[PDB]
């Protein structure tokens, strides 16, 4: 995974965060959205996959 600089996060003032929004898409007709984020999901520290 990795880190990034968000325009805003926990304490408002723009700050670095292990969780950061890179892109947001909303083309679903159901209005659901798919987020790209600086953290990694479904993988362990060792890199093994786990839900």
């Amino acid at each position: 995974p990795y880190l990034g600089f968000c325009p805003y996060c926990r304490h408002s003032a723009p700050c670095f965060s292990p969780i950061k929004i890179e892109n947001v898409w909303d083309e679903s007709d159901d209005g659901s959205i798919r987020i790209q984020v600086s953290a990694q999901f479904g993988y362990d520290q060792a890199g093994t996959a786990d839900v």
Binding site: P7, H11, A13, P14
Partner: protein, 102 residues
């Protein structure tokens, strides 16, 4: 760590509770930026009312007041989130340092 208020109890004495049990809201929950004496300073999302509340057993009442806390922005673009890059212009913000005197 704590705040004090006059209790409803009929002996009329001051009672204390921890400040982490206070909350402020307008639409969603606000962030309590600072507090000093009978003044609370908070950043709140826009809304039509302000609400202060306690979350401490019997002391779980709350108070709301009608106030047009509409969104406002320094500069010339109705930005929602403070921009990461751009010009820096003279703006006025409440100093979170509770020592400052208004």
């Amino acid at each position: 760590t704590k705040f004090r208020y006059m209790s409803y109890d009929h002996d009329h004495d001051i009672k204390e509770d921890s400040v982490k049990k206070i909350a402020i809201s307008t639409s969603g929950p606000c962030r309590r930026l600072g507090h000093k004496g009978y003044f609370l300073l908070a950043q709140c999302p826009p809304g039509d009312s302000v609400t202060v509340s306690i979350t401490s057993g019997a002391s779980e009442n709350s108070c709301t007041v009608e106030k047009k806390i509409r969104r406002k922005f320094v500069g010339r673009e109705e930005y929602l989130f403070p921009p990461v890059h751009g010009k820096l212009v003279k703006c006025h913000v409440y100093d979170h340092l509770k020592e400052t005197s208004a």
